[PDB]
Design a protein around this ligand. Structure first.
Ligand SMILES: Cc1ccc(NC(=O)c2ccc(CN3CCN(C)CC3)cc2)cc1Nc1nccc(-c2cccnc2)n1
Ligand SMILES: NC(=O)c1cccc(-c2cc(Nc3ccc(OC(F)(F)F)cc3)ncn2)c1
Ligand SMILES: [Cl-]
Length: 286
């Protein structure tokens, strides 16, 4: 099946022995994801596998989806091993790891307002692409983005809901939801769409603007929906330019139809500071 002449050929299928498997990534925070080396390229990779013994079809579904998407700001599929168990999905490795930790740990002279704007812009580009292709993310947040060289940011989906410890994800409607990132219509009506990703993007924008603070700080999960329904929204973070906060507020429109498209959001990021410096706005606000 590995030869192009074969009727069973799949360009994505790679030789398992081409990859040298190292340790589990990030202590175990990603489940069954391992650091790897793709031998012939001397390239470090991330390798997702299945744990011993119905989630097989979900895994294969993920591999199929990843074959359909290609964008500079979406984590890139490099290959799979899905002919026989154990199944692998191989992606590029991103030097600086997840964006949430990166924000919390970064040198702030380096990761200035300009860099933060670039990170937000890149994420909106990935999401504009997903929007165009009629995909939904379903769990957009800083914890699901990666950071590489020169502040490159890629959107990922690590399937965190039943891995992550703590109260980021909590029980809701038979599953685990990240309540503070979840659009109200998703919480209340189980309605997910690109517009519920827009809501989540607004929360992610707030994470960027605060260098990774936890959203709705000090507010009980039990109160989030009621507060949002009564028009409460997180306040503008310290130093946040008004035009950026306006964009956050647009993402958090109660009616999903009133929220901007990711194409509109990306355009806004390109125009917002075309003639003016984000550094100057932050300074003005402070
Ligand atoms: C090894 C692997 C296997 C699969 C995936 N998959 C994805 O990241 C992903 C992204 C977008 C989609 C699109 N999808 C559309 C439909 N909706 C419902 C879900 C999202 C699907 C999968 C990533 C990885 N990469 C990965 N995983 C965990 C950790 C890391 C990692 C950690 C630290 C440094 N560098 C890399 N890297
Ligand atoms: N040391 C300081 O002067 C100080 C104190 C508090 C906040 C900040 C601060 C805020 C800040 N905010 C900020 C920057 C960019 C931004 O746009 C985007 F979200 F990234 F798109 C939205 C908000 N950027 C850089 N520094 C600095
Ligand atoms: Cl989808």
């Amino acid at each position: 099946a590995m030869d192009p002449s074969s009727p069973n050929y799949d360009k994505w299928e790679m030789e398992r022995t081409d990859i040298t498997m190292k340790h589990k990534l990030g202590g175990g925070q990603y489940g069954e994801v391992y650091e790897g080396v793709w031998k012939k390229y001397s390239l470090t990779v991330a390798v997702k596998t299945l744990k011993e013994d119905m989630e097989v079809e979900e895994f294969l579904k993920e591999a199929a989806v990843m074959k359909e998407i290609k964008h500079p700001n979406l984590v890139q599929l490099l290959g799979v091993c899905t002919r026989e168990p154990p199944f692998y999905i191989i992606t590029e490795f991103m030097t600086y790891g997840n964006l949430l930790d990166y924000l919390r740990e970064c040198n702030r002279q380096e990761v200035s307002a300009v860099v933060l704007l670039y990170m937000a812009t890149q994420i909106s580009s990935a999401m504009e692409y997903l929007e165009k292709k009629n995909f939904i993310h379903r769990d957009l947040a800083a914890r699901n983005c990666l950071v590489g060289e020169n502040h490159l940011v890629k959107v990922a989906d690590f399937g965190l809901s039943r891995l992550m410890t703590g109260d980021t994800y909590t029980a809701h409607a038979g599953a685990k939801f990240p309540i503070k990132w979840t659009a109200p219509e998703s919480l209340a009506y189980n309605k997910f769409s690109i517009k519920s990703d827009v809501w989540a993007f607004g929360v992610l924008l707030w994470e960027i603007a605060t260098y990774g603070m936890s959203p709705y700080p000090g507010i009980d999960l039990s109160q989030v929906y009621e507060l949002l329904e009564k028009d409460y929204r997180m306040e503008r973070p310290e130093g946040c330019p008004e035009k950026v906060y306006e964009l956050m507020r647009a993402c958090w429109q109660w009616n999903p139809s009133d929220r901007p498209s990711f194409a509109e959001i990306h355009q806004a990021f390109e125009t917002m500071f075309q003639e003016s410096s984000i550094s100057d706005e932050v300074e003005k606000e402070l």
